[PDB]
Tab-separated table of C-alpha atoms in Angstrom:
chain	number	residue	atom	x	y	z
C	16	UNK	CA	-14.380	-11.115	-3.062
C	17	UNK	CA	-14.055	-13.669	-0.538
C	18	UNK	CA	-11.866	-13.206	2.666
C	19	UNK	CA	-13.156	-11.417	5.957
C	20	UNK	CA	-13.014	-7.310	5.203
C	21	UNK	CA	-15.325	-6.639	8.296
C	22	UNK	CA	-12.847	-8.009	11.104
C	23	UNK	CA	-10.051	-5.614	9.662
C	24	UNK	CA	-11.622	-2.479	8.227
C	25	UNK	CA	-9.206	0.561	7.248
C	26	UNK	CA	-6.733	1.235	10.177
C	27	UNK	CA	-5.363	4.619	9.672
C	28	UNK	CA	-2.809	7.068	11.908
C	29	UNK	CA	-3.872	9.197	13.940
C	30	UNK	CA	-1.765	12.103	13.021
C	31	UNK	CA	-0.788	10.892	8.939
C	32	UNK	CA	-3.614	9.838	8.419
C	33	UNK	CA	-2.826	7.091	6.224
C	34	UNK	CA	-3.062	3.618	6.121
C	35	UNK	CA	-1.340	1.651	8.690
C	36	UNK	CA	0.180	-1.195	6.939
C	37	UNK	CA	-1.625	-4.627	8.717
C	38	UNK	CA	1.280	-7.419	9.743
C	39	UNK	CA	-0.888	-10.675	10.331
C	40	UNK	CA	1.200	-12.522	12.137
C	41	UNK	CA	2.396	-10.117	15.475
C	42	UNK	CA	-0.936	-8.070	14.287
C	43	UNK	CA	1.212	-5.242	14.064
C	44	UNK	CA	0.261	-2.154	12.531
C	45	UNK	CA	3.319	-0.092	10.994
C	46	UNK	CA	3.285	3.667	9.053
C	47	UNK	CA	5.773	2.682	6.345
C	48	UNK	CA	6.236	6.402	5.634
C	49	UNK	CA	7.101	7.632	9.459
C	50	UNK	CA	8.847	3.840	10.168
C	51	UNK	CA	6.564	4.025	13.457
C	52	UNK	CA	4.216	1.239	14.776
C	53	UNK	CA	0.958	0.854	16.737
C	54	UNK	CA	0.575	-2.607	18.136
C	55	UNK	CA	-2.782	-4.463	18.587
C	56	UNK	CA	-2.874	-5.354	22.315
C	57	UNK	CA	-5.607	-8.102	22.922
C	58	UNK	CA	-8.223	-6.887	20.166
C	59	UNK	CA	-7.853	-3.766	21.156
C	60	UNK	CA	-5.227	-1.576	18.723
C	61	UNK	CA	-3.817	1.215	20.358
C	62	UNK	CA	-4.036	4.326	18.446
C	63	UNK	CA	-2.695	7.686	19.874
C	64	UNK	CA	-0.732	10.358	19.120
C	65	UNK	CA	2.642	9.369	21.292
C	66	UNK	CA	1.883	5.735	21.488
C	67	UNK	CA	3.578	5.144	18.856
C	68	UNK	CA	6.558	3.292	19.097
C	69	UNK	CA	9.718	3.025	16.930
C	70	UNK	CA	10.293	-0.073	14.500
C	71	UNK	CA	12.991	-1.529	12.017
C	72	UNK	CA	13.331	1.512	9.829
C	73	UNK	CA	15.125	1.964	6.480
C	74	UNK	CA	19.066	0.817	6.743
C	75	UNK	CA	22.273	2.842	7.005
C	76	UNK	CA	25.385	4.125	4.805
């Protein structure tokens, strides 16, 4: 199928469960459900609980 599915594997949160929603560029990983993100920090993607931080959610009135 081409591409590289072995460096990204299925990134899921910790407490939805579901998957986190990959941005290539920032490697950002964002729950598009909760409007929360996990960032990657050097290789290493931070997954916890509280550690997640707030992004650009869903707009306003």
């Amino acid at each position: 199928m081409s591409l590289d599915p072995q460096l990204l594997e299925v990134l899921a949160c910790p407490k939805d469960k579901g998957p986190l929603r990959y941005l290539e560029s920032e490697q950002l990983l964002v729950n598009e459900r909760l409007n929360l993100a996990y960032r990657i920090d050097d290789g290493i993607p931070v997954l916890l609980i509280d550690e997640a931080t707030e992004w650009t959610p869903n707009n306003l009135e």
